[PDB]
Ligand binder design. Structure first.
Ligand SMILES: *C(=O)NCCCCCCCCN1C[C@@H](C)O[C@@H](C)C1
Ligand SMILES: *C(=O)NCCCCCCCCN1C[C@@H](C)O[C@@H](C)C1
Lengths: 527, 527
């Protein structure tokens, strides 16, 4: 049976799914690790013991235990990212979409979802890539990991809760792919891992981490970097804010053992309830429990590794969205609302920049402002709003990416950089949000291909042409078969990704990023 | 006799001069102070004892003792500002151009030449305002003062050499005007003082200085401000760099008395020879001996006075030139030459900015650079050159003026601000220098009126219309009789001054000056 597959972990039964006038097979819910429940909570991932029967992979599995959004109940735009299956601590599983008839050795793609490391799901409608596997003819794999304290609590030193376990799940899922993806038709030596936000930062974290580079070939990073300010905390910070969690749930903090035990006694939702209370400051685009530069998963500091080319060298295709910051300002800054032009005032603006560069001192905040302010019309509300939408993206996404790009592209074997700036015609979010964080994925996963979803023809055509870029690159190591230029430390070329005739530019946000990537940091140290 | 005049200091014989197809009288060389020679050197100005005969004022007098330029021998563009009469320590005199027939009470104008306080002359061809008095029908007065150490050596405490004596000469010349300008037809209650560079900074220094505000009515400041970085030094700096002068001429520095005496023994040219050796750093647009915030001529710090409206409140008309910095870069920065496009390299540029903001630390120099650098084409030589021509002007002229403007225009009775940006058609300097420091004066003095000087008709028309602005303002307190808007702390309007139909703008170099006037200073203190 085309749906019956024999893995190194046991036989597994798949299911036939319809895909744009055709059909293919999907093996949903396959388990790659032991349930991270109970005493194992906070512990590193555990390999999944073999099953002596036939595992049923016809239905998506539970979503991990995570903070669910309720700022816009009903509203699809928000609920569209919320978990869509019974959340549970038993969540480490993976789904595989295999073409039909089943291949013998085709390009494999492994997807790592985002969520600020505090949220995420592999079972999201937008992540349903039966279209990618289908259209592009690849074997799409959707790994899943532990987000939240459940998978990032960093009580460094302790072995019961060392941190980064969530990245470890990611890794134990890439091994499984490396070990059995052949029995599914995939080619274990041509496996591309691609992700968004925290998933894009995880991708590159696997390029840096010595223990996982050998587990994949090339990578695609979307709106994320490992050297992103919110992508990691120190072992001290993780420690300090891990204790603050015990303190919040009234735990015993006499010693790690007591704490860890206590935290392991609290139900999941109790941890979730006081999760955000441990952050060091009032901030925008900052999350509680994220990877720690522990010295193991990460030999040394990220920068120093990017400086010594101490990272996996291969091909990488990456980029950013035109309007990243939007989502975090509407959700955190004062003066923003889902149902207005949210034109901001010098005040609200000045107050937002403090929420954006939280680690900045007053001289710093000054630099930022003077930098993103049209002093010829400093009262423009639409300007104050947009310039604020630029500080959130620039500082948290584009600039940290452009530094990892320039550093990688000096040891890597090839780099392709894009700037996606097309506003889905059916977006529901207020126009003032522009090309929003995470709204390229739908083009990447070919949702514009399914009619009922309301997309122009021009749009379905971008998805189709973007999907081939991703897929062609994943298989050949180059997006091309009209040409998307190679990014070089010399002519830093990149292109635009939208329904208009390909246009090639060069040096994505140089200026703003020279300030973020070079000036600000310096200043903030002198001062 | 229309040329025979009786002043409070004695009878004086003038001379008839031809002015554009007509004639008027000029009383040149009238003395307003006692020869500042010998033991009086460095001492404050001394009133000129009365003369028991008829003083001959038919010929320009000596130019003060000053550093003469020899970087472009022959070349008019440079020699045009050099002294044109036997330099001498006996130089405190004034020249008066009176219309003919002689008025009974007309608007008076007193001109204070520039020179970085180290140079200057009242007898310069460009300063020959027989055209202003003529055309505009005013009584033009050309005061003269002591420049150099000869008139600015600041051994504060000492009474033999207290400093600012040069400003004191300026003052003793304004008194004389206030006391006898009536006998020349002038109106002592409608006397405007106007100047360029150091002369524009002196103008406003007389607005701040309590002891001179009552000596004039309104003021015109051109390319200068009292709060200009090179316009003054502290009493410590003047002291320290005054001693360094003795040290340079091998004087005894056991005590003030010895030093002062010694300095008083050296011939003038010996002082001049080692003059520039006392500056604290390698710099551009910085001069040795300039006014000191001594606590007498200046009650307190300049800023604090501009903050407490502790200054003469009246009308003021002022402005800046499109390309100020030019002259100082060609004369001091590496990569510049009188006979080339002087396109600069990131290097030469980076090295020039250090010459421009000499008091800046490395974090500062960084801020400046990042601020005046197109990181999208950081190698543009024409850009590197111009952006460097902007840092010299911005930081040394426009910005310090725009801060004194905004501060004054909050206690003053009216403010008119211009931006002169027309390149004389007959300029000899390399085009890369644009609208150069001090090249508006010729329009202000109506040189475009004399044919033989080669000027378009469009040009003679600007001079004529600019002269009326100056004169009409000097008499009415308003430049107008098509309208030049009043500068207000609200809509900071100003206009352009060139042969094209008047255009009104608003907020001269806000952005760049928010950095110079606000950010940089802050940073440079935090750091
Ligand atoms: C990449 O991983 N980006 C993170 C994606 C998260 C979307 C923005 C929402 C984050 C802001 N939170 C703040 C907490 C306190 O409340 C929730 C509702 C929104
Ligand atoms: C307003 O007062 N501006 C000052 C006008 C001076 C013109 C620029 C020349 C100044 C630079 N100096 C430097 C010394 C060491 O040599 C002379 C030849 C030029």
């Amino acid at each position: 049976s085309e749906l019956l597959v024999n893995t190194k972990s046991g036989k597994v039964m798949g299911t036939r799914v319809p895909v744009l006038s055709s059909h293919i097979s999907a093996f949903l819910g396959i388990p790659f690790a032991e349930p991270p429940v109970g005493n194992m909570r906070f512990r590193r991932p555990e390999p999944k013991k073999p099953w002596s029967g036939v595992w049923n992979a016809s239905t998506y599995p539970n979503n991990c235990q995570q903070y669910v959004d309720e700022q816009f109940p009903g509203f699809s735009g928000s609920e569209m990212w919320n978990p869509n299956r019974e959340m549970s601590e038993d969540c480490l599983y993976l789904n595989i979409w295999v073409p039909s008839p089943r291949p013998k050795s085709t390009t494999v793609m492994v997807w790592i979802y985002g969520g600020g490391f505090y949220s995420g799901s592999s079972t999201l409608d937008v992540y349903n890539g039966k279209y990618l596997a289908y259209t592009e003819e690849v074997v799409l794999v959707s790994l899943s990991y532990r987000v939240g304290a459940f998978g990032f609590l960093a009580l460094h030193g302790s072995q019961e809760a060392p941190g980064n376990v969530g990245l470890l799940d990611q890794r134990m899922a890439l091994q499984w792919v490396h070990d059995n993806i052949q029995f599914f038709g995939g080619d274990p030596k041509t496996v591309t891992i691609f992700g968004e936000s925290a998933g894009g930062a995880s991708v590159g974290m696997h390029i840096l981490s010595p223990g996982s580079r050998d587990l994949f070939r090339r990578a695609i990073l979307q709106s994320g970097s490992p050297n992103c300010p919110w992508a990691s905390v120190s072992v001290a910070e993780g420690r300090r804010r891990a204790v603050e969690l015990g303190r919040n749930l009234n735990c015993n903090l006499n010693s790690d053992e007591e704490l860890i035990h206590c935290l392991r006694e609290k139900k999941p939702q109790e941890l979730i309830d006081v999760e955000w209370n441990v952050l060091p400051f009032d901030s925008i685009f900052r999350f509680s429990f994220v990877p720690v530069i522990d010295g193991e998963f990460f030999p040394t500091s990220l920068e120093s590794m990017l400086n010594s080319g101490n990272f996996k060298k291969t091909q990488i295709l990456l980029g950013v969205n035109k309007d990243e910051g939007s989502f975090f300002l509407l959700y955190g800054a004062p003066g923003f609302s889902k149902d207005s032009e949210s034109k901001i005032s010098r005040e609200d603006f000045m107050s937002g920049v403090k929420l954006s560069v939280p680690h900045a001192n007053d001289l710093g905040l000054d630099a930022v402002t003077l930098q993103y302010t049209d002093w010829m019309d400093d009262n423009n509300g639409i300007k104050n709003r947009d310039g604020l939408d630029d500080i959130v993206g620039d500082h948290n996404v584009i600039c940290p990416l452009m530094h990892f790009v320039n550093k990688y592209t000096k040891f890597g074997n090839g780099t392709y950089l894009y700037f996606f700036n097309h506003r889905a015609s059916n977006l529901v979010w207020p126009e003032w949000m522009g090309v929003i964080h995470g709204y390229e994925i739908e083009f990447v996963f070919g949702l514009p291909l399914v009619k009922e979803l309301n997309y122009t023809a021009e749009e379905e055509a971008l998805s189709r042409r973007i999907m081939h870029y991703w897929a062609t690159f994943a298989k050949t190591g180059n997006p091309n078969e009209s040409k998307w230029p190679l990014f070089t430390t010399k002519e830093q070329k990149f292109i635009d990704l939208n329904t208009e005739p390909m246009k090639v530019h060069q040096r994505l946000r140089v200026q703003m990023c020279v300030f973020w990537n070079q000036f600000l940091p310096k200043l903030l140290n002198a001062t």
